[PDB]
Every structure is written in C-alpha cells, then in structure tokens.
Design a protein around this ligand. Structure first.
Ligand SMILES: *[C@@H]1O[C@H](CO)[C@@H](O[C@@H]2O[C@H](CO)[C@@H](O[C@@H]3O[C@H](CO[C@H]4O[C@H](CO[C@H]5O[C@H](CO)[C@@H](O)[C@H](O)[C@@H]5O)[C@@H](O)[C@H](O[C@H]5O[C@H](CO)[C@@H](O)[C@H](O)[C@@H]5O)[C@@H]4O)[C@@H](O)[C@H](O[C@H]4O[C@H](CO)[C@@H](O)[C@H](O)[C@@H]4O[C@H]4O[C@H](CO)[C@@H](O)[C@H](O)[C@@H]4O[C@H]4O[C@H](CO)[C@@H](O)[C@H](O)[C@@H]4O)[C@@H]3O)[C@H](O)[C@H]2NC(C)=O)[C@H](O)[C@H]1NC(C)=O
Ligand SMILES: *[C@@H]1O[C@H](CO)[C@@H](O[C@@H]2O[C@H](CO)[C@@H](O[C@@H]3O[C@H](CO)[C@@H](O)[C@H](O[C@H]4O[C@H](CO)[C@@H](O)[C@H](O)[C@@H]4O[C@H]4O[C@H](CO)[C@@H](O)[C@H](O)[C@@H]4O)[C@@H]3O)[C@H](O)[C@H]2NC(C)=O)[C@H](O)[C@H]1NC(C)=O
Ligand SMILES: C[C@H]1O[C@H](O[C@H]2[C@H](O)[C@@H](O)[C@@H](O[C@H]3[C@H](O)[C@@H](O)[C@@H](O)O[C@@H]3CO)O[C@@H]2CO)[C@H](O)[C@@H](O)[C@@H]1N[C@H]1C[C@H](CO)[C@@H](O)[C@H](O)[C@H]1O
Ligand SMILES: *[C@H]1O[C@H](CO)[C@@H](O)[C@H](O)[C@@H]1O
Ligand SMILES: *[C@H]1O[C@H](CO)[C@@H](O)[C@H](O)[C@@H]1O
Ligand SMILES: *[C@H]1O[C@H](CO)[C@@H](O)[C@H](O)[C@@H]1O
Ligand SMILES: *[C@H]1O[C@H](CO)[C@@H](O)[C@H](O)[C@@H]1O
Ligand SMILES: *[C@H]1O[C@H](CO)[C@@H](O)[C@H](O)[C@@H]1O
Ligand SMILES: *[C@H]1O[C@H](CO)[C@@H](O)[C@H](O)[C@@H]1O
Ligand SMILES: *[C@H]1O[C@H](CO)[C@@H](O)[C@H](O)[C@@H]1O
Ligand SMILES: *[C@H]1O[C@H](CO)[C@@H](O)[C@H](O)[C@@H]1O
Ligand SMILES: *[C@H]1O[C@H](CO)[C@@H](O)[C@H](O)[C@@H]1O
Ligand SMILES: *[C@H]1O[C@H](CO)[C@@H](O)[C@H](O)[C@@H]1O
Length: 472
C-alpha cells in the first residue's frame, strides 16, 4: 500500500537525518565534537543543542543493529561514539566525577564540556542505555576477531556504567521525561537488562561482573511492584495516574526475540504488557481533538502521559511509534511460538479489536488466531499511518505534533524520532535485535531486598582503533 512505500522512503530519510545530527561532520550540527549525537539542531525555542546520554544511547543501539545487519558504512560513526564516551565518562559535572556519581548526569554540551545549570539530575537510565549500546558492538567485535578492541576499549567503558547501575539502582532520581523525582519503570527495566547482558559480555571477554550477578535478580524483584493489577505504574512518588508511554518504551527496549510472553519481564506479548497497552493508549482518546470520532478498534495519536502540559501536552511521534512497535514485537513472538493465549488480564485488549475474543489458547492454524493477528496488524499499521499523515512533506519528524491540527511543534528533526521510526519499521518487517538473555533472567526471587553492590571504576583512554574492516 502507500504506507509500505512511504516507510521504505522514510527509512532512508531517517538514516540520513540521524547522521546529519552526529559530530563532527554532521551537516546540521557543526560545533559538535566527534561521535557526539545531538538531540536536535534546534538552538532556540527549544534549545535541544546538547547531547543527552539517553538519546545518544538509544540512537547508537539502533545504528549498531543496522550495522550488524549489513549497513557497514556506519562503522566509523560507532567508533567515534565510543571514543567520545571514554572522554565524557571522566568529565567532572554537577552529578559528580567518574567514581562519585558523574555517570548519572543527563546531558552535556556538544563540545564535551559539562552543562552546569539546573536540570533534573541524576537520570539513572543513561548508564544502562549506554552500556547496552556498547555491548552490542562489543559482541560484533568478538564475533569478528577484533578481540583486543572488545577487551581493552569496550569492556572497560561498559564496566564503569555497570558499576554505576549496581550501586545506585535502589535510589530515587529523575525519570526519562526529566520531570519526576522518584523511581521509574522504564529506568528499572533497562537497568535490569543492562546488568544481565553485561554479565554475559564480561564472561565473554574473560572477566567477570559479580555486581551484575548479585543485583540483577533484586532489580527484577523490585520491578514486579510496578504492576497495579490493571496497568503498569510509570513512577512511584508521583501524584499522576501513572499511565504513561514510559511503560511501552520499557517493554519495546527490553524486548528479547527469544522470550515468551513473560509477565515478570513485561515482554511485548505478556498479558500485563497487553493490558497496559490498552490502558495507556485509551488515556489519549478523549484529550486530543485530533482523535475525535475514532472508535476503540482504531489507532489514535499517542502522547507521553495524559497529565502532560509540556507545550500544552501533545502527541509525540516516538510515542505513537512505540504503540505500533510493541504490537509488531507481539506479532513476531506469537508467530515464533506458534500460538497466542488470551487470559482474563489481556481479554479487554483483544475484545476491543476482535469482539468474539474469549480466554483460551489459539494455535497459529486456527481461525481465531488468523482473525486476531490480522486485526492486530491493522491496528499497529494505524499508528504508523498517523505518523505518516503528520510528517513534513520531505520526511522531517519533530518531537511533537499538535493535539488539534497535527502541525509539527517543539524541537525540529529530533534524532530520537528518526531512531523510533527505524526500529518500528524493522519490527514491522520482522527484523529483530539480538537477544539479551531474558530466558535465563526472568526468575523472581522469593523475597526482595533494598540493597546495592559497589563495582569498580577506572578511567579509559582510547589510544587508537584497530583497522577494522566490516563486510557483509
Ligand atoms: C525538510 O525541509 C525543512 C524546510 O527547509 C528542513 O528544515 C529546515 O532546516 C534548516 C536547516 O537546513 C533550518 O535552518 C535553521 O533555521 C534556524 C532558525 O530556525 C527558526 O527560524 C526559522 C525561520 O523562521 C522564520 O521563517 C519562517 C518561514 O518563513 C516563519 O514561519 C517564521 O515565523 C520566521 O519568519 C523557522 O522555520 C524555525 O522553525 C523550525 O524550528 C522550530 C524549533 O525547533 C520548530 O518548532 C518549528 O516547527 C520549525 O521546524 C525556527 O523557528 C537557524 O538558527 C539555523 O541557523 C544555524 O544553522 C545554520 C546551518 O544549518 C548556520 O548557517 C547558522 O549560522 C546557524 O548556526 C548555529 O546553529 C547551528 C545549529 O542549528 C550550529 O551548528 C552552528 O554552529 C551555530 O550554532 C552556534 O550559534 C547558536 C546561536 O543560537 C548557539 O545556540 C550555538 O550554541 C552555537 O554557538 C538554520 O538556518 C530551518 O529552521 C528548518 N525549517 C523548518 C521549517 O524546520 C528540514 O531539515 C528538511 N528535512 C530533511 C530530512 O531534509
Ligand atoms: C529499593 O528496593 C526496595 C526493595 O524492592 C523497594 O521496596 C519496595 O517498594 C515498593 C514500592 O513502594 C513496595 O510496594 C508497595 O507495597 C505496599 C504494600 O506493602 C503497597 O501499598 C504499595 O502500593 C503502591 O503500589 C501499587 C503497585 O504495587 C499501586 O497499585 C498502589 O496504587 C500504590 O501506588 C501509589 O502509592 C505509592 C506509595 O507507595 C506512590 O508512590 C505511587 O505513586 C502511587 O500513588 C506498593 O505496592 C514494596 O513493598 C517494597 N518492598 C520491600 C521488600 O520493602 C524500594 O521501594 C526501593 N527504593 C527505591 C528508591 O528504589
Ligand atoms: C528538554 C526537557 O525540557 C523540559 O524539562 C525541563 C523543564 O523545562 C524545567 O522546568 C525543569 O523541570 C522541573 C519542573 O519545573 C518541576 O516542576 C519538577 O518537575 O522538576 C523538573 C526538573 O527539575 O527541568 C526540566 C529538565 O529536568 C521538559 O519538561 C522535558 O520533558 C524535556 N525532555 C525531553 C527532551 C530530551 C532530549 O531529546 C529527552 O531525552 C527527554 O526524554 C524528553 O522528555
Ligand atoms: C525467564 O527466565 C527464567 C529463568 O531465570 C525462566 O525460568 C523463565 O521460564 C523465563 O525463561
Ligand atoms: C529463579 O532464579 C532467580 C535468580 O535468577 C532466583 O532468585 C529465584 O529464586 C529462582 O530460583
Ligand atoms: C544490600 O543488602 C544485601 C542483603 O539484603 C547485601 O548482600 C548487600 O551487601 C547490601 O548490604
Ligand atoms: C550500595 O548501597 C548499600 C546500601 O543499601 C551499601 O551497603 C553498599 O555498600 C553500596 O554502597
Ligand atoms: C563502591 O565501593 C567500592 C568498594 O567497596 C568502590 O571501589 C567503588 O568505587 C564504590 O565506591
Ligand atoms: C576496581 O576494580 C578494577 C578492576 O579490577 C580496578 O582496576 C579498579 O582500580 C578498582 O580497584
Ligand atoms: C583502571 O582500568 C582502566 C581500563 O583498563 C585503565 O585505563 C586504568 O589505568 C586503570 O587500570
Ligand atoms: C577517564 O577519566 C579521566 C579523569 O579521571 C579522564 O582524564 C580520562 O579522559 C577518562 O575520561
Ligand atoms: C587512560 O590512560 C591515560 C594514560 O595513558 C590516563 O591519563 C587516563 O586517565 C586514562 O586512565
Ligand atoms: C592506549 O595505549 C597506551 C600505550 O602507552 C596507553 O598508555 C593508554 O592508556 C591506552 O591504553
């Protein structure tokens, strides 16, 4: 259809736009140092001309996955990013130094200097996201015979971030939206993932991560507290409803293609994540004029949380895309398992799309399965069509689009918007990321403990990169 063709062209635009926003040769961000991912080229109203640890880590993980799938030209970009982080980790900033909390700093200036003004800090998701981005590249290096680069450059950088996560996971901080000082779902979810794949990577390079091992099960134990019985609470210490796309992002960014529909890790197809999907998406149905007249079986424009007032509270391209991505992931999981189960917890999600839905197990050859997957795919594509409808004529994607008229607003050419388009398109095409080991990390301890483990910190100096030749 036109969505299919639009997506193919948009994937090309998205890749180009991301590169334009990375220093020091990116066309839109002159001034940014080598390997520095800039959030948006907007220098004023709003000023997003900074580098955030979260946006950078999410964008680089996307590029690493494209690279591993054959986009070999991205090699230099990834190397520059890793080199830049060896420096950033050691930059003294308002959150502290390398070994005293500095790794939790949310953003830095594009020239690698500290941002010293007031900001919601620290944001503890950053080190976890950066670790996940680097581990993926480290895995490729190991697999392709560049052991020294993996052991001497990547591992030591990752070791710093993993130590930060194990030491401070059980402390409050700001959420991914940089507004709530408390304990956040997305953050705890990505931290659990990071420690698990961090331990595997440490073993692979001939080292160890005892703090990853002792803390991962405890983070998972705590993660269970976020389930309210009807949806996933986005944050503790908040007065809001708790319905927030923060939870959809937590699910899609911790999606493991080898995982079943596991409730303990909130996988995309788990009953808990499906129930949550409907609760979150439904919260935007009556608050945006853009959604007027749409039925419960139709996709709608999705924002961050219903109480949002940032730029008056509007839908976000990356949030609308996350709503579609969780469903593409679920379709993949059901297909791989050869069945789909409907439980009392997820019944409402299914009933809204297929009125004949009833609890039970449906094999992939059954009529019910066929009806449900068709309806889910159409629903998911619906979210992507809304994005297509409001993207600029040349493919530009801003941070937000107007709740009433759909015009683009806030930061223009937002790097994260482009990465979210790339991942949603990939999942739609059944292109999935490497597994992180969820199948051996979904067991919940019988008793949760408020605890931590201190790892180790050491400054890394990147002398040089071996002449890596990527072909495939
Ligand atoms: C698809 O097509 C679109 C349309 O062409 C493409 O988007 C355009 O892309 C160009 C870049 O190629 C952007 O140019 C920059 O513009 C800003 C100014 O932007 C503001 O003003 C614009 C014009 O307003 C006037 O005209 C319009 C239309 O007639 C009218 O509506 C308005 O009322 C007014 O009369 C606005 O259009 C623009 O709006 C957009 O952005 C908003 C905020 O993000 C957003 O909310 C809106 O929805 C809208 O999207 C906005 O209000 C210039 O400041 C900027 O200039 C810098 O960069 C150029 C090089 O690109 C350089 O020559 C300049 O010297 C300057 O350099 C500084 O900034 C750079 C980073 O941006 C940095 O690298 C430099 O080192 C330097 O930085 C230093 O100085 C700054 C000083 O503040 C400091 O902060 C730094 O720290 C540092 O010291 C560009 O000229 C267009 O804005 C943009 N247009 C739109 C509509 O988005 C799109 O890219 C295409 N997509 C694809 C995939 O191809
Ligand atoms: C450090 O780790 C320890 C160990 O894991 C953490 O301790 C656990 O903390 C959770 C969260 O506080 C706690 O769960 C609460 O248990 C209470 C009963 O024992 C519940 O009454 C409480 O209810 C809230 O959460 C429900 C979902 O579980 C919601 O349905 C309900 O509406 C409540 O949420 C509202 O109220 C809270 C107030 O707590 C508010 O913050 C929310 O925004 C919302 O308005 C919880 O279920 C566990 O009992 C604790 N476990 C142990 C062993 O002590 C500790 O929190 C961690 N600290 C940090 C900073 O990470
Ligand atoms: C770029 C972010 O801009 C906003 O965040 C600022 C906000 O404007 C400030 O007012 C202040 O917010 C404080 C509240 O005023 C106060 O009531 C209480 O909530 O504490 C907060 C924090 O001190 O600081 C924050 C920054 O911490 C906006 O609200 C954020 O959502 C914006 N973040 C987005 C952009 C960024 C880069 O692309 C993304 O990483 C992030 O996920 C986005 O949400
Ligand atoms: C998640 O991982 C646990 C082990 O930690 C398994 O028991 C479970 O079945 C799922 O694979
Ligand atoms: C599954 O595994 C976890 C550790 O990963 C245990 O804590 C739990 O008790 C169960 O054996
Ligand atoms: C947190 O608590 C655990 C036990 O609950 C310890 O093993 C750890 O050293 C830290 O004190
Ligand atoms: C993490 O925090 C615990 C306290 O909960 C300490 O015991 C540990 O040494 C580390 O600092
Ligand atoms: C936690 O504690 C260890 C020692 O117990 C330190 O090496 C680490 O830097 C952090 O302070
Ligand atoms: C923690 O452990 C690392 C790795 O052994 C040391 O290099 C560091 O100095 C600290 O003692
Ligand atoms: C801690 O570890 C780093 C990484 O190997 C070294 O660069 C530093 O000198 C210290 O031994
Ligand atoms: C590790 O940290 C030191 C400062 O302690 C820096 O000089 C180095 O560049 C790296 O960031
Ligand atoms: C990397 O190594 C250099 C020395 O070669 C240190 O100065 C730096 O702090 C980091 O340990
Ligand atoms: C690259 O190699 C030099 C060799 O002298 C080290 O000093 C530096 O710390 C980095 O590992």
């Amino acid at each position: 259809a036109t969505l299919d063709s639009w997506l193919s062209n948009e994937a090309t635009v998205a890749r180009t736009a991301i590169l334009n926003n990375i220093g020091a040769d990116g066309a839109w961000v002159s001034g940014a140092d080598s390997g520095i991912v800039v959030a948006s080229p907007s220098t004023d109203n709003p000023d997003y001309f900074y580098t955030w640890t979260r946006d950078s880590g999410l964008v680089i993980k996307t590029l690493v996955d494209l690279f591993r799938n054959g986009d070999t030209d991205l090699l230099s970009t990834i190397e520059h990013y890793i080199s830049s982080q060896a420096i950033i980790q050691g930059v003294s900033n308002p959150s502290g130094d390398l070994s005293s909390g500095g790794l939790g700093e949310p953003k830095f200036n594009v020239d690698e200097t500290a941002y010293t003004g007031s900001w919601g800090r620290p944001q503890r998701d950053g080190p976890a996201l950066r670790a996940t981005a680097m581990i993926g590249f480290g895995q490729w290096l190991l697999d392709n015979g560049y052991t020294s680069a993996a052991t001497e450059i990547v591992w030591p950088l990752v070791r710093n971030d993993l130590s930060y996560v194990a030491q401070y996971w059980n402390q409050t901080g700001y959420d991914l939206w940089e507004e709530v000082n408390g304990s956040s779902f997305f953050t705890i979810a990505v931290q659990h993932r990071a420690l698990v794949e961090g331990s595997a990577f440490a073993t692979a390079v001939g080292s160890s991560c005892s703090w990853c091992d002792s803390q991962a099960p405890q983070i998972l134990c705590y993660l269970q507290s976020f389930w309210t019985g009807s949806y996933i609470l986005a944050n503790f210490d908040s007065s809001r409803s708790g319905k927030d796309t923060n939870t959809l992002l937590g699910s899609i960014h911790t999606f493991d293609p080898e995982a079943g529909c596991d409730d303990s890790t909130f996988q995309p197809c788990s009953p808990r994540a499906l129930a949550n999907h409907k609760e979150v998406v439904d919260s935007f149905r009556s608050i945006y004029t853009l959604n007027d007249g749409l039925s419960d079986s139709e996709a709608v424009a999705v924002g961050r949380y219903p109480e949002d007032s940032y730029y008056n509270g509007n839908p976000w391209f990356l949030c609308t895309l996350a709503a579609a991505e969780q469903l593409y992931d679920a379709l993949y999981q059901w297909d791989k398992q050869g069945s789909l189960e409907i439980t009392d917890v997820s019944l409402d999600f299914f009933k809204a799309l297929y009125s004949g839905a009833a609890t039970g197990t449906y094999s992939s050859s059954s009529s019910t399965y066929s009806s449900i997957v068709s309806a889910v795919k159409t629903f998911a594509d619906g979210f992507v069509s809304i994005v297509e409808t409001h993207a600029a004529s040349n493919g530009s994607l801003s941070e937000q689009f107007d709740k009433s008229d759909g015009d683009e607003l806030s930061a223009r050419d937002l790097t994260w918007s482009y990465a979210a388009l790339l991942t949603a398109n990939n999942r739609r095409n059944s292109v999935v990321p490497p597994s992180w080991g969820e199948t051996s990390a979904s067991s919940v301890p019988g008793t949760c403990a408020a605890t931590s483990a201190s790892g180790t910190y050491s400054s890394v100096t990147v002398t040089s990169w071996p002449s890596i030749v990527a072909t495939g």
